[PDB]
Ligand binder design. Structure first.
Ligand SMILES: *[C@@H]1O[C@H](CO)[C@@H](O[C@@H]2O[C@H](CO)[C@@H](O)[C@H](O)[C@H]2NC(C)=O)[C@H](O)[C@H]1NC(C)=O
Ligand SMILES: *[C@@H]1O[C@H](CO)[C@@H](O)[C@H](O)[C@H]1NC(C)=O
Lengths: 52, 438
């Protein structure tokens, strides 16, 4: 069957010189992951629980 | 007419190809890549699912001994125990205080939902490539699905196109993969018939509907407690649930080159690597004769503004004089700068404006309008916005032109030093000649 999930709040993006700063404000334990689209990627993933 | 070219394998990047033949006006072909797919050839090794332990009701014999024989079942385990006094809710079960005997057996089978939830082990081989390509020229604008193999030949508007083969045999899948739901993992698995308890592969089956099953889960039986009717057993927990607990990281969030991984069928999409060669055969009806094409003479170029950014940050203007109004095909004959429009309208006024994008401090390139050519060179300033949400629309070149300011300073310094060194050479030669004359 089809069963329902909520969309997480959009994060706060702060620009920079070849960097970004993300303010994350979770309401529930949410999974956050990121990777780079180059030759060798620097993957990362974690379970964000509190605001970080 | 036959032509051959190469295009970068970048999704969404426009490509312009120039076709020039004697007796006809030049033609510009626009080709774009909408979506690509890469699929390996898979041969199934086995599948795994959570198991269930079937235990039947124990057998009890009063004043008798019963021996149990072996059976052809997965991990069948049977045992016989002597000297038991089972109790029930009414009272004793048999008279014989110590002559009773209990037979207990257990085995393992696949779960009732193995048909719906299972993990598959695959071996990966050479991979194919399918692409969707949009082609534009004249009054033709069509998207076609092709195989990038050097085999498929498609026909668009009476024109024959052959694509491929790819120039970089690279695949993100390792030799052995494990597929579950919509995730692929690049991990190795035990061979068939050599599974170990507690980890992945505790039970294996050649296919979902196969009738043979290999299991190794340490079904050790134990003696029943006195005054009780039960069968105890110790078994290492299912390895499939453990693997689901700490499988690791999926290839979905790790694949290089921004490779979007999808399942059913296993494939990778929008993988940007290498370049695709294109061979085309054009009919003679897609060109225009020189006589009815416009004539351009005395074409000079200048740049109004430039700012090297991912967007189309540049504007150039071309001045010219003609003999009749018409439409021309324009092109840039270099890789530093990429244009935006492949066609232009030429009137008697004599001024056209074009857009372009670049990534060098000072570019220099040749721009062709119909049969006329001109040279454009200008200075650009860096942008201010640090991060943009769209991919670059310029081929990455950084080296400036030999007549740019930095290289101009380098040339002037080098020329001064070289002239001074050459003067020193000449004076030394003259002195040594006048010395040897004596
Ligand atoms: C009824 O009970 C008697 C004993 O209470 C059972 O007789 C025993 O049978 C076993 C094996 O047949 C012998 O080893 C014992 O020595 C016997 N006991 C006696 C006192 O003779 C008999 O088998 C039982 N029969 C049924 C049908 O339950
Ligand atoms: C080509 O056709 C597609 C599909 O209708 C359309 O989105 C696109 O704008 C067309 N291009 C031109 C130049 O008309």
């Amino acid at each position: 069957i089809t069963c329902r999930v909520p969309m997480a709040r959009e994060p706060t993006v702060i620009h920079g010189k070849r960097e970004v700063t993300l303010h994350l404000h979770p309401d529930h334990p949410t999974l956050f992951s990121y990777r780079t689209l180059g030759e060798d990627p620097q993957y990362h993933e974690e379970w964000v629980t509190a605001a970080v | 007419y036959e032509h051959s070219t190469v295009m970068p394998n970048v999704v969404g990047f426009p490509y312009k190809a120039h076709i020039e033949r004697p007796g006809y006006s030049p033609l510009t072909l626009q080709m774009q890549v909408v979506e690509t797919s890469l699929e390996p050839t898979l041969n199934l090794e086995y599948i795994t699912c959570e198991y269930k332990t079937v235990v039947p009701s124990p057998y009890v014999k009063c004043c008798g001994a019963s021996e149990c024989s072996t059976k052809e079942k997965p991990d069948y385990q049977c045992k016989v125990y002597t000297g038991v006094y089972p109790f029930m809710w009414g009272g004793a079960y048999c008279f014989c205080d110590s002559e009773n005997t209990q037979l207990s057996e257990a085995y393992v089978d696949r779960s009732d939902v193995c048909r719906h939830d299972h993990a598959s082990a695959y071996k990966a081989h050479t991979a194919s490539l399918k692409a969707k390509v949009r082609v534009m020229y004249g009054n033709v604008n069509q998207t076609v699905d092709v195989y990038v193999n050097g085999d498929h030949a498609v026909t668009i508007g009476g024109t024959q196109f052959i694509f491929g083969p790819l120039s970089s045999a690279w695949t993100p899948f390792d030799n052995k993969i494990v597929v579950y739901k919509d995730e692929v993992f690049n991990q190795d698995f035990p061979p068939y018939g050599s599974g170990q308890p507690g980890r992945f592969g505790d039970i294996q089956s050649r296919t979902v509907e196969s009738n043979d099953l290999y299991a190794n889960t340490a079904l050790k039986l134990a003696r029943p407690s006195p005054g009780m009717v039960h069968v105890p057993y110790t078994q290492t927990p299912s390895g499939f649930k453990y693997w689901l607990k700490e499988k690791g990281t999926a290839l979905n969030t790790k694949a290089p080159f921004g490779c979007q991984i999808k399942t059913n069928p296993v494939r990778a999409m929008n993988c940007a690597v290498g370049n695709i060669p294109v061979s085309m055969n054009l009919p003679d009806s897609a060109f225009t004769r020189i006589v009815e094409a416009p004539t351009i003479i005395d074409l000079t170029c200048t740049v109004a503004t430039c700012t090297h950014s991912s967007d189309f940050g540049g504007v150039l203007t071309l001045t010219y004089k003609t003999d009749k109004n018409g439409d021309c095909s324009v092109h840039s004959h270099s890789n530093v700068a990429t244009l935006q429009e492949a066609t232009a309208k030429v009137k008697t006024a004599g001024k056209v404006t074009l857009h372009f994008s670049t990534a060098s401090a000072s570019p220099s390139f040749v721009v062709s309008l119909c049969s006329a050519r001109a040279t454009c060179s200008a200075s650009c300033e860096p942008p201010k916005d640090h991060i943009v949400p769209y991919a670059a629309s310029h081929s990455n070149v950084v080296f400036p032109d030999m007549s740019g300011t930095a290289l101009s300073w380098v040339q002037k310094i080098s020329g001064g030093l070289g002239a001074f060194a050459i003067g020193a050479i000449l004076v030394l030669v003259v002195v040594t000649c006048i010395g040897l004359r004596r």
